Design an enzyme around this catalytic site. Structure first.
Site, PDB file in Angstrom:
ATOM      1  N   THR A   1      36.542 -80.226  -2.222  1.00 55.87           N
ATOM      2  CA  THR A   1      36.535 -79.173  -3.855  1.00 55.87           C
ATOM      3  C   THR A   1      36.170 -78.961  -4.731  1.00 55.87           C
ATOM      4  O   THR A   1      35.898 -80.729  -5.233  1.00 55.87           O
ATOM      5  CB  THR A   1      37.650 -78.713  -3.749  1.00 55.87           C
ATOM      6  OG1 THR A   1      38.443 -78.724  -2.501  1.00 55.87           O
ATOM      7  CG2 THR A   1      38.586 -78.217  -5.019  1.00 55.87           C
ATOM      8  N   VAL A   2      35.289 -78.406  -6.182  1.00 60.61           N
ATOM      9  CA  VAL A   2      35.379 -79.176  -7.435  1.00 60.61           C
ATOM     10  C   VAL A   2      35.706 -78.717  -8.394  1.00 60.61           C
ATOM     11  O   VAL A   2      37.264 -77.603  -9.059  1.00 60.61           O
ATOM     12  CB  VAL A   2      34.224 -77.995  -8.091  1.00 60.61           C
ATOM     13  CG1 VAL A   2      33.011 -78.910  -6.784  1.00 60.61           C
ATOM     14  CG2 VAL A   2      33.710 -76.930  -7.556  1.00 60.61           C
TER      15      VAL A   2
ATOM     16  N   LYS B   1      34.559 -83.777  -8.182  1.00 65.75           N
ATOM     17  CA  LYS B   1      33.865 -83.413  -6.868  1.00 65.75           C
ATOM     18  C   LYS B   1      34.509 -84.532  -6.010  1.00 65.75           C
ATOM     19  O   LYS B   1      33.941 -85.571  -6.008  1.00 65.75           O
ATOM     20  CB  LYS B   1      32.657 -82.775  -6.862  1.00 65.75           C
ATOM     21  CG  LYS B   1      32.146 -82.116  -4.918  1.00 65.75           C
ATOM     22  CD  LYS B   1      30.801 -81.815  -4.838  1.00 65.75           C
ATOM     23  CE  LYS B   1      31.023 -80.985  -3.288  1.00 65.75           C
ATOM     24  NZ  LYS B   1      29.378 -80.691  -2.872  1.00 65.75           N
TER      25      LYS B   1
ATOM     26  N   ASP C   1      20.054 -73.942  -1.377  1.00 66.58           N
ATOM     27  CA  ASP C   1      20.640 -73.087  -1.138  1.00 66.58           C
ATOM     28  C   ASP C   1      20.399 -72.791  -2.874  1.00 66.58           C
ATOM     29  O   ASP C   1      21.790 -72.485  -3.292  1.00 66.58           O
ATOM     30  CB  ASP C   1      22.038 -73.617  -1.300  1.00 66.58           C
ATOM     31  CG  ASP C   1      23.140 -72.307  -0.236  1.00 66.58           C
ATOM     32  OD1 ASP C   1      22.434 -71.328  -0.455  1.00 66.58           O
ATOM     33  OD2 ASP C   1      24.043 -72.980  -0.583  1.00 66.58           O
TER      34      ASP C   1
END
EC number: 2.7.12.2
Lengths: 262, 256, 260, 258
Positions: free
Chosen positions: D14-15, D30, D118
């Site tokens: 999670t950021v 993060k 990505d």
């Protein structure tokens, strides 16, 4: 030596499941063994291996199958009947007798080896003897056939009590072993076992893994007692070298002075 | 196997009641699984083979009901865990012994993999012997990588943790030499030469060891010793010297 | 053509016969489904790519592909007289003409580095025009080089080469090309004899099929046949796989030249 | 920064958006949890390595990073305007100037032997200075030479290359470098068109996304668009992986030169 299974009638149970059958027209005995085709890939590979070896072999000291039957999707092989059974826990202290037994077993093993068949389970219980006092090599359940003269074997198969050192401690050579030399080890333990009349290691053969491995891999290999003749002492040393290229081939041992005695 | 068990240090202290001499008694237990069975074969083969002044020789082996009991040389003044040695001359003679045993083990193609001060035993004669071969491998060749992430996390090279570079495969000879350089620098400081505890979590140990530049000797120390710990703690493992090549380091020339 | 333009008529045996309502044209429609398993995902990628790329008179052409509702539907040629399953050809010019056409398609596929791996009379389709086409690519694989072994045990046990049943010596690797030319040769001798050439139920146990194919000598054409057809089947049915001819070399055999 | 007790969690990204209360400068934070599995740990050690090395205007650098409680806290520079997600940017000069920045950032990582794996508009972020930076390295890998394949099929499916979906033909192996140049050119055409350049949606089934990107021809810019920009997407979106230009070959493309 038969045609079909209607000629065969089962009479006793032998010893895997083996029967004595009697061929009804000829009154002659045989052994009948079933090999059932289950769905395991590694059992199917050993079925194919055992079937190929069994039909191909023709030697007086390898047990010959005379016929094969696919009754109901199980393979039934029709072997020679060996009427005096195994040499299991046989004591051959007579050194002349031991040499004649060893010559026959060596003819057989030299045959299998020069056709690139490694047996991988040479134990006194797989050396069968008959009325005629002749000896023949028997169980091909874990035996293999090899594409070259020098193709390594990677599978841990057989009886641990008669395994070669390099067949128990597999770490250094990464599982691979000279399957031939491993059989020559297994014979030399067997022939000393006949001479001694015990298993020639100082551990129970039903003993634990680490108790067997410590006797075979970590001790000096068994030597024939000093009581015995030189040529028998030198014979077992040609078989039970712990470093495998040091030990002789089966073909070479037939020219050994111990075996040249009859 | 008719001697008498005395003290528990599992490893026992035993005294052989005929000659009243002390020994160290390790048990090895027979398992059913191939990695533990081949680890018994690796260990019980290194114990009998080794014969060096700086390696714990074992004298006898026994099998009791499927468990192998191995009888080793008893080391009088225990392990060097905690130990602070800050006189360079003293540390140089101490390092000279541990390198002699390690350069012996490597040229017989034995990697230790768990060199740490917990396994550098010392006796009343003030001489040092490499100790626990429970994780050790015998290599086929002089170049043969090891894939097994084993040993003690705090003391193992960054390539034994950051396995993904060469797909888990590391140089074991350098894997010990990084483990030795950490242990010699831990002697000079009196503490573990990293910014975290050795008993820490995986990730906190991983950032300390793999991700920062490797530790250095303080500039207070002589240039011989500062050069020596950088010859053992290189981050790219072929730059690290071999155990034998370090015995010609001029830090080691400070011995005797 | 669109997926709602064409509708189902009758089932071929899972794959249906569709008619294009606008052009009133017969076609075959095959459903390909996307499973959560990843070995399914490769086999779709293999099967689909093969179907679009192939262009030969003797290999079932794909005409259109549709993405409907997470299912890929592939519009194939319709073949009017079904398959050559159970077929008996005794006129030898009739069998050479059939053989030359199956060989043309297989020699095409082998140069495009496709090994078919389920060559059998079931997957040899024939139409009113009496042209033979190679059909089912659900187990076929497309290979990197001109020789490169296969590992996968796929296909029908009865039409596999010995080395696809046995898997000992090369340890499950096999020449997929030579494995096809065996599958062809059994299919062509099945046409000549009117029976399965091997003396066992095709729908048989593994062990009975293993001893018939691996452990006896490969079947010969009978001596009542021609020497050109006897020699042709022996060029396909070599038990040592590199002794087998390629499909390319068999197209120049004297028996194939009987087609005129 | 110096410590974790000098940051206040503000808004989820999670950021996390955090503010450094001594400096009153915003940064991004993060968490990476210690997982049991040897392969998530393999991804952790790759992810951390990439963050420390990067020194570029167009890569999200981390200023510092922290550990407590078996959790790795990494402290990244804050991107206040957000991502280039859904950006319909049609101006052949303005996009030229965004394609200059993503190509500087990508060519830096590729000669530093890091495959991002990505690349998407979502992972391309923009600030108040309207400079663009490459972001999530959760899937990215670092490689031994310039000439080392990738074996793992991870990332997001709708921006994969044909070779990253059609795994069988090369036994799971693909060029990671040119597989990012594909993912780049799909994003650059998505910016010009303002829609995803393939027929189907991103969120569709894998059978729908395969037949769009593996079994159809790769997309081109309409011929109405400039013969610099029509050529540009032709140098990124080849079906054959070596026919892609290198990301450093594209920095001196005539479209990026505008």
């Amino acid at each position: 030596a038969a045609k079909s299974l209607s000629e065969l009638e089962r009479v006793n149970r032998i010893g895997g499941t083996v029967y004595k059958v009697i061929h009804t027209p000829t009154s002659r005995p045989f052994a009948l063994k079933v090999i059932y085709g289950n769905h395991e890939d590694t059992v199917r590979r050993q079925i194919c291996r055992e079937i190929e070896i069994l039909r191909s072999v023709d030697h007086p000291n390898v047990v010959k199958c005379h016929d094969m039957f696919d009754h109901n999707g199980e393979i039934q092989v029709l072997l020679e009947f060996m009427d005096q059974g195994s040499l299991e826990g046989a004591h051959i202290w007579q050194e002349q007798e031991l040499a004649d037994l060893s010559r026959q077993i060596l003819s057989g093993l030299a045959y299998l080896h020069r056709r690139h068949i490694v047996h991988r389970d040479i134990k006194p219980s797989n050396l069968l003897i008959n009325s005629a006092k002749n000896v023949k090599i028997a169980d091909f359940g874990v035996s293999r056939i090899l594409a070259q003269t020098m193709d390594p074997c990677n599978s841990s198969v057989g009886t641990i009590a008669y395994m070669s050192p390099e067949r128990i401690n597999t770490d250094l050579n990464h599982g691979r072993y000279d399957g031939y030399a491993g059989d020559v080890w297994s014979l030399g333990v067997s022939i000393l076992e006949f001479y001694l009349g015990r298993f020639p290691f100082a551990v129970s053969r039903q003993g634990d893994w680490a108790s067997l491995m410590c006797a075979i891999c970590m001790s000096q290999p068994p030597e024939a007692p000093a009581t015995a003749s030189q040529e028998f002492r030198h014979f077992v040393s040609c078989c039970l070298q712990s470093d495998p290229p040091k030990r002789w081939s089966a073909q070479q041992l037939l020219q050994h002075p111990f075996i040249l005695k009859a």
